């Protein structure tokens, strides 16, 4: 048994764009269908319900605006969603409700594995990267990645050579773009005398940024 | 719509100690052919949901015996007599028995140890963001427990909280600890109009707050 979500990406406020989800090893017309959405904060919210037998169900904050309909002959779900606005950007999941029509019993049972929606007005950019470098046994550098767009960016340590004491933060959106920083920490005895390096990485724009950290007096 | 709560918000345990969540509804979650939907679901980092619980207490088809749910009417738990590493993660009460079917907030079991003080350190903004007109101060907030932890900026003195942004990593798989980041972001000018730059963070570990500071004419 497998639910395959498609259609994800980046649409703009007052957009439109359709999922689709791929059933796979069980009767697809014998269930009743779910979407749910997880935000960002992580919050959980059901989205619509659609039953075996064809009764619909929605949320009232997207009645008029989302249409789901089912292809039986193709096992698939979709969601056709229109006047898309920036509470809609979730990760949406696809789900197998435990239930047809008129049985006493009703759950989640089966989920794919979700495909992200953005509804945000901005451009692919890359992040400017600035060194953190301190004005003791052991000491601790950063990287400072600001104003980038989309997610993620990747940031690694001396080429993955430091991987322990590296601490690298969530991004947060901030007059939207990302901003995220990533810490190391080292031996007094290895920095300055050896270099130091952050290498940032933001696979939407291909970009590579080296930033070495080195000494100064601020 | 019925509004699902759940207790506590993180729940700090032991590995083989006995877990127990709360979940309350704000209204009956009978349906009117006398069944109660309140299901409980196991959400791990980069998953989705997993069903537990189905219809208050039946367990799952794969669900290990030391899951266990009652309760009725607005009042529903869930239970580990005994906490698995494998059950790390972020429990979900959830009610189908009206539209729209809703879910609790969630209860994220973290694993308790040791309070340690957080290792403080402070940056002044580089000369490459100064050159653009910005100026950013960094303060890394370093392996500490518990993750409850209070942090304030000072310029000169007086609070400020326009323009900060924090950042809290989750729960270190090696050392079980938490690590935070909060940065100042002010421009070149106001900047250069103050000298000193504090960090101060409250944390149970020190009765006193923990500061850190930056003057910018001791550089
Ligand atoms: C207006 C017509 N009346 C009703 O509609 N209902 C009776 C309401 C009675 N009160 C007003 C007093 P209701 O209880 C409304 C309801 C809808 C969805 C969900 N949950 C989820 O969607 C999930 F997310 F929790 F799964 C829970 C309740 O319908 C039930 C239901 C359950 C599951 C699904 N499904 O999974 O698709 C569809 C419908 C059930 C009767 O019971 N019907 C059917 O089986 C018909 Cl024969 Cl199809």
């Known amino acids: 048994v497998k639910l395959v979500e498609s259609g994800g990406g980046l649409v703009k406020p007052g957009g439109s764009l359709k999922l689709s989800c791929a059933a796979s090893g069980f009767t697809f017309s014998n269930y009743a269908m779910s979407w749910v959405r997880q935000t960002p904060e992580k919050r959980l919210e059901w989205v619509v319900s659609?039953?075996?037998?064809?009764?619909?169900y929605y949320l009232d904050s997207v009645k008029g605006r989302f249409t789901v309909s089912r292809d039986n002959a193709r096992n698939i779900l979709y969601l056709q969603m229109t006047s898309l606005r920036s509470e809609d950007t979730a990760m949406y999941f696809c789900?197998?409700?435990?239930?047809?029509?008129?049985?006493?019993?009703?759950?989640?049972?089966?989920w794919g594995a979700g495909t992200s929606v953005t509804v945000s007005s901005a451009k692919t950019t890359p992040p400017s990267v600035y060194p953190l470098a301190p004005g003791n046994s052991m000491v601790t550098l950063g990287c400072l990645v600001k104003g980038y767009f989309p997610e993620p960016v990747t940031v690694t340590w001396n080429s993955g050579s430091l991987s322990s004491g590296v601490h690298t933060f969530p991004a947060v959106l901030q007059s939207d773009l990302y901003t995220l920083s990533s810490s190391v920490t080292v031996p007094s005895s290895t920095w300055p005398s050896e270099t130091v390096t952050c290498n940032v990485a933001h696979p939407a724009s291909s970009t590579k940024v080296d930033k070495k950290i080195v000494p100064r007096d601020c | 719509d019925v509004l699902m709560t759940q207790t506590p918000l993180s729940l700090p345990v032991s590995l083989g100690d006995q877990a127990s969540i709360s979940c309350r509804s704000s209204?009956?979650?009978?349906?009117?052919?006398?069944?109660?939907?309140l299901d409980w679901f196991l959400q791990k980092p980069g998953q989705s949901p997993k069903l537990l619980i189905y219809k208050v207490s039946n367990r799952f088809s794969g669900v290990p015996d030391r899951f266990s749910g009652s309760g009725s009417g607005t009042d529903f738990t869930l239970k580990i007599s005994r906490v698995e590493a494998e059950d790390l993660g972020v429990y979900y009460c959830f009610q189908g028995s009206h539209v729209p079917p809703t879910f609790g907030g969630g209860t994220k079991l973290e694993i308790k140890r040791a309070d340690a003080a957080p290792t403080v350190s402070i940056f002044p903004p580089s000369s490459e963001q100064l050159t653009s007109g910005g100026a950013s101060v960094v303060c890394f907030l370093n392996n500490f427990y518990p993750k409850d932890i209070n942090v304030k900026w000072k310029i000169d003195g007086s609070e400020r909280q326009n323009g900060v942004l924090n950042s809290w990593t989750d729960q270190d798989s090696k050392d079980s600890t938490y690590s935070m980041s909060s940065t100042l972001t002010l421009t070149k000018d106001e900047y250069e109009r103050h000298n000193s730059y504090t960090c101060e963070a409250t944390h149970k570990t020190s009765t006193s707050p923990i500061v850190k500071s930056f003057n910018r004419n001791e550089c």
């Open positions: 659609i039953s075996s037998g064809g009764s619909i």
């Open positions: 789900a197998r409700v435990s239930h047809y029509d008129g049985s006493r019993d009703w759950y989640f049972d089966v």
């Open positions: 209204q009956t979650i009978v349906h009117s052919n006398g069944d109660t939907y």
